[PDB]
Ligand binder design. Structure first.
Ligand SMILES: *C(=O)[C@@H](NC(=O)c1c(-c2ccccc2)noc1C)[C@@H]1N[C@@H](C(=O)O)C(C)(C)S1
Ligand SMILES: *C(=O)[C@@H](NC(=O)c1c(-c2ccccc2)noc1C)[C@@H]1N[C@@H](C(=O)O)C(C)(C)S1
Lengths: 505, 505
């Protein structure tokens, strides 16, 4: 009855989701089925049958024999344990030659990679009455009308399964090491905006349904973060274009007094009068507050808006969050300079960061390559590189890139743990407090931080941008503070560059 | 924090869904927390702590101490058993005065009635990071833009919790008795189209989440059925208005031969030359095929479209199914005359049935009374009675009602099991085969039927229409065939009529 639901593909044609035939176990227990037959067509020994069935379906013989003993029933099924059985399960059941036992073909949605870009691909759910499948999250839901049928259309993603494996492995390592409450990593083509890989933790397995529903939100498009100091790059860009930033000019570091709050550099005492470039390498908060004064508060708010913040990127993901620029008072304004109070989505961060490597042009990130029917060959949609806006000049973009280089590679860098032997890396570190969901403060604890890194490589002319973020390590929180996401950035970026044939040296 | 999510109300202002404060259990286990303190601020006695917590949260003391022994962790939590704790649990944990133990407030979505109109109300799921709630099904999803905030708007439904209680209890009894694969009942105000009660089985509990996801489809709006002989009332109305049906005129019963299929009256042999009125009371299939010949197949197809079949009712529910009139050959056309091949939604059946009690006007069924903000008092939406179309004259409607009376109350009735002592009832029975999801044909088995009853009372001038359907009884399938859904219709209708102050005779 149901039309075949279309497939979801990665950018090289690997199947990410497709319909398959599986099998459901049925046991006829009524004698009436065997009235006309010499060999029985119903279960004659319920105990032996239960014992043999327990060697295939995940159910104890005692529960099977209980289900076989239901009164006033012609045939029985075994709930979830008796459905979605494989062809090999079917073979071993059938070789037992158990009277009354058969297997019914049923259509199931199959995700060949299991837990793999799960919050992007989503999950399609089955209506048992009809077999009708309906997407409940991500691409399966966004494109449900196209995917469902004739035959539904296929959706091709920009995701590269080879790069996605690197991301899934690195994120597993972060879970083991740090048990964070939230975790994401994303890899984008620095020159086109294509999402090459995306994952988050915790997540679900779309194949089995394990943990589906425990977190509805996709981190890339629907979750918001106070970004911390990765956000300083946009304040730097603005201050550069306005002439307030001079890399060699000195400024007074240490602290600033804003509406009765002491906002200090991370070492409390500062470094005296130091060049602005060094302050950016040190990730000086007083530098950013100084530059905001020089530019002017009204102008800086417009600057963050021109970089796309506070607005949806208008991607094809459902319910994209807008974030919010925290600007309601001077304290909010000043803390926004280093990525506190303001909330962003990771996709806004990627869009904004792409400006520095595309002559000032922001690229709209995208992950849908095409929607098209393989039978009719109709192309309903084709993704493309699109400029989201040009907030800065090419000259400003280069001067920002020079400072991002210094953050990682300066002889005074405090981010050398993001270096990769053989490759040149650049980017910006972040450590931020995390808003408590309930009650009006920050999560309390020894190191209750969202730590992140917006990185790109090769430096100056990158092939990819890799952004990774970790919220609230429940294990090794002190090291999470010290090393940030470097134990995820380094395996993802190194393997990705090798796979993209970037020569090491 | 998140704005308060708006409430879902029943028609009398009873809360169906609301935000509440609950509590999450946290245990600080690292000694470092107690460095400066005159009282320990971490769990010092792991066994005494675990033993005492087991008297509140539902966990074995051995498991609790296992989690208290996690290494390199400042504090731990206790999974699902440790969240959604009540204010009373908070009191009981706190008088225990356990060092290191506190409770964090969290906002949860509370459904005070538990498993109650679950497939209509739906469920909102929580993002652990932010506390943000998002509707995943039903009203919570449909109106999620309104419900989420300030404060979200409230949604008021037409549902009456008192009638809804009757439906839930009756459906539980049908599950206990027949263990059907699918089951629904709906109660509609016969003069306004308001849905006073709706339930289905199997379903989920929106409070706990138990079984949420096993069936995405709301039976009323999204599931389709081959209705069986309840569909005959619309062919009857057509034949009346076209002058083909005359209650006293004779016709030849027995069987008909259509494209190599023998279609018989239910007793195989028929009853000879009998009055058309009696044929309709006996639920004669040959009567309906004869009337279709008399009207003409092209014209009958237009008749069903005029009753709203094959098209969505344009209700407020997402993804409403349109169904389909099966008309592609004479076999489909003839089997459609008695409700096979054509598929309908229950809401189309209610809409079509309302014509007989509103002088030929179909009423568009509706379940949303209001969407409105309790703070601003802005009314975003107000539901109302709306005519879906007038397919028949008042004269035709009266003549149909006379035949519906006879089905139940004729001295030759085969539906006397739908009678209610003290109340006058009318309606139409149905028994239909069920299409197999995979492979062609119908579900096989001794009595593999969708059985149903489209009823209304008091007869002629009803207060409510009650439509109940049961697909594929897995227990007592013989009784399901004999009694249909009478064991649900009678308690629902009787209790509803008493609750609505209809006096019994
Ligand atoms: C940007 O992220 C900046 N971070 C903060 O000032 C900051 C902190 C903090 C935590 C621990 C020690 C000092 C400060 N908590 O919330 C915020 C917003 C600077 N950059 C960071 C980085 O990781 O590069 C730091 C730690 C150097 S401070
Ligand atoms: C309408 O529902 C009609 N039903 C059928 O003819 C029918 C059957 C069937 C099942 C069992 C015995 C005889 C027929 N299977 O599929 C169909 C479409 C008539 N009305 C029914 C009713 O309950 O009123 C019956 C059983 C009287 S036949």
């Amino acid at each position: 009855q149901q039309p075949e639901r279309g497939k979801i593909y990665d950018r090289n044609g690997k199947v990410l989701a497709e319909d398959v035939e599986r099998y459901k176990l049925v046991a006829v227990i009524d004698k009436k089925a065997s009235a006309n037959s010499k060999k029985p067509r119903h279960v004659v020994d319920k105990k032996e049958t239960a014992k043999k069935l327990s060697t295939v379906i995940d159910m104890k013989p005692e529960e099977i024999e209980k289900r076989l003993s239901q009164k006033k029933a012609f045939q029985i099924e075994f709930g979830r344990k008796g459905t979605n059985l494989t062809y090999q399960d079917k073979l071993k059941i059938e070789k037992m030659n158990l009277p009354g036992i058969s297997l019914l073909p049923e259509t199931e949605r199959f995700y060949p990679n299991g837990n793999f870009a799960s919050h992007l691909i989503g999950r399609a759910q089955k209506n048992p009455d009809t077999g009708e499948l309906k997407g409940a999250l991500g691409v399966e839901k966004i494109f449900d009308s196209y995917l469902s049928g004739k035959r539904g259309d296929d959706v091709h993603l920009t995701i590269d399964s080879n790069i996605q494996v690197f991301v899934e492995e690195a994120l597993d390592g972060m879970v083991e090491r740090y048990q964070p409450k939230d975790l994401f990593a994303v890899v984008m083509d620095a020159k086109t905006g294509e999402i090459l890989a995306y994952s988050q933790r915790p997540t679900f397995n779309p194949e089995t349904g394990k943990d589906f529903g425990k977190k509805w939100a996709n981190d890339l498009y629907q979750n918001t973060y106070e970004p911390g100091s990765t956000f300083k790059s946009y304040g730097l860009a603005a201050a550069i274009q306005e002439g307030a930033f001079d890399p060699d000019k000195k400024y007074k570091s240490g602290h600033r007094d804003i509406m009765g709050s002491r906002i200090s550099d991370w070492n409390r005492v500062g470094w005296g009068e130091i060049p602005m470039s060094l302050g950016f390498t040190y990730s000086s908060n007083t530098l950013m507050m100084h530059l905001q004064d020089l530019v002017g508060a009204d102008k800086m708010k417009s600057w963050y808006e021109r970089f796309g913040f506070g607005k949806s990127t208008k991607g094809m993901f459902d319910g994209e969050a807008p974030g919010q620029i925290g600007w309601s008072n001077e304290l909010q304004q000043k803390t926004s300079s280093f990525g506190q109070s303001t909330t962003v989505t990771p996709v806004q961060m990627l869009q904004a960061q792409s400006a520095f490597f595309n002559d000032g042009n922001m690229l709209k990130p995208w992950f849908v390559n095409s929607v098209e029917n393989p039978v009719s060959k109709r192309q309903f949609y084709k993704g493309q590189k699109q400029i989201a806006g040009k907030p800065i000049t090419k000259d400003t973009a280069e001067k920002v890139e020079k400072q991002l280089d210094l953050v990682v590679n300066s002889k005074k860098s405090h981010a050398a743990n993001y270096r990769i032997d053989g490759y040149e890396v650049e980017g910006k570190t972040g450590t931020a407090q995390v808003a408590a969901p309930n009650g009006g403060g920050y999560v309390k604890g020894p190191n209750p931080y969202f730590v992140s890194f917006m990185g790109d490589a090769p430096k100056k002319n990158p092939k990819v941008i890799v952004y990774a973020g970790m919220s609230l390590a429940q294990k090794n929180d002190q090291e999470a503070y010290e090393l940030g996401v470097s134990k995820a950035f380094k395996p993802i970026m190194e393997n990705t560059l090798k796979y993209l044939n970037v020569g090491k040296s």
